[PDB]
Amino acid sequence: VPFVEDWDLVQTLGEGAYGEVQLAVNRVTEEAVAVKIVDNIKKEICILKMLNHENVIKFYGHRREGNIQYLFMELASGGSLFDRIEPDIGMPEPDAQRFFHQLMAGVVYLHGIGITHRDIKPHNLLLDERDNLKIADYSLATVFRYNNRERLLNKMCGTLPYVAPELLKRREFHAEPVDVWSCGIVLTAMLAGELPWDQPSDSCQEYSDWKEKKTYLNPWKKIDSAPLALLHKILVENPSARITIPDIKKDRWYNKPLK
Numbered sequence: 001v002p003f004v005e006d007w008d009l010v011q012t013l014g015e016g017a018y019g020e021v022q023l024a025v026n027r028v029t030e031e032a033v034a035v036k037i038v039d040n041i042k043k044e045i046c047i048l049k050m051l052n053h054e055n056v057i058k059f060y061g062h063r064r065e066g067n068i069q070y071l072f073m074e075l076a077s078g079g080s081l082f083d084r085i086e087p088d089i090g091m092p093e094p095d096a097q098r099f100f101h102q103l104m105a106g107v108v109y110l111h112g113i114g115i116t117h118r119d120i121k122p123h124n125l126l127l128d129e130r131d132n133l134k135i136a137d138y139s140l141a142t143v144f145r146y147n148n149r150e151r152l153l154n155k156m157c158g159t160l161p162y163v164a165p166e167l168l169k170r171r172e173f174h175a176e177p178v179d180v181w182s183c184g185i186v187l188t189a190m191l192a193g194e195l196p197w198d199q200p201s202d203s204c205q206e207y208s209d210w211k212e213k214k215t216y217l218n219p220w221k222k223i224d225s226a227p228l229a230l231l232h233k234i235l236v237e238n239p240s241a242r243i244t245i246p247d248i249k250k251d252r253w254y255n256k257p258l259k
C-alpha cells in the first residue's frame with residue numbers, strides 16, 4: 001500500500017532499467033493512471049510535455065518527493081503489443097495492418113515535432129481499452145530538429161534486433177530513417193512472430209541472407225507477398241534509398257482493405 005498525494009500504488013505494470021511503473025488509483029475519484037517511479041530525467045520530462053496525439057502516451061505531470069520522481073502518464077489498460085504476438089505465428093494480418101497504421105500515425109507526429117523516439121519495439125507499444133496503439137517510453141528520445149534545422153545523431157542506442165545498420169556503421173546518421181527501420185522490424189514480428197536477425201551486421205548470417213534476397217527462409221516465407229513487398233522497401237541497408245513515411249502511406253499493402 002504505497003501512495004503519493006491522493007493516489008494508491010496498487011500493482012506493478014512493468015520494470016525498467018531505473019525503477020518501475022505502477023498502476024495508480026485515486027481512491028477519492030477512482031481514476032486510474034500509470035506512474036513511472038525513478039532514482040536525463042530533466043530532458044525526458046521536457047520531451048513528455050510536448051506530446052499531444054492519440055497514438056502517443058499522454059503526460060499528466062510529475063512530483064519530485066525526496067530521491068524519487070513520479071511521472072504520471074496515461075494508462076494503456078490493454079498492456080503491450082508484445083503480448084499480442086504469438087511466437088512463431090504473429091497475429092492476423094488485419095490486426096497487424098491496423099496496428100501499423102497507428103504506429104505510423106504516431107511516428108509522423110513525433111517526427112513532425114522534431115522528436116525521434118529511438119527505441120521502437122513491441123514492449124514500448126501499448127494498447128488502450130479499445131486496442132488503440134500508443135507509443136510509450138521517452139527515456140531514449142531526443143530532439144533532432146530545432147528551428148527548422150536538422151541535426152544528425154551520433155549516439156548509439158536502442159535494442160540490437162531493432163536497430164538500423166547505419167547506427168552500427170556510421171559515426172553520424174539521420175534520425176528519421178532509423179525509426180522507420182525499427183517500424184519495419186515491428187511489422188515483421190507482427191506478421192511472423194519472430195525477429196529476423198540478432199543485429200543487422202555483416203557478421204550475422206540472417207542479415208546476409210536477407211541482403212541476398214533469400215525469402216524462401218523464415219520469417220519471410222510466413223509473410224504474404226503484399227506486406228513482404230513493403231518490407232523490401234523498409235528494410236533497405238542504405239538509409240537514403242530507404243522508403244520514407246510519405247511513401248509508405250502510398251504502398252499497396254498499406255492501403256489494402258482487410259477483414
Ligand SMILES: CCNc1nc(Nc2cc(F)c(C(=O)N3CCOCC3)cc2OC)ncc1C(F)(F)F
Binds near residue numbers: 012035075076079080
Ligand atoms: C510498460 C508499462 N508502462 C505502462 N504500462 C501501462 N499499462 C499496462 C502495461 C502492462 F504491461 C500491463 C500488463 O498486461 N501486465 C500483465 C498483468 O500484470 C502487470 C503487467 C497492463 C497495463 O495496464 C493495465 N500504461 C502506461 C504505461 C506507461 F508507463 F508507458 F505510460
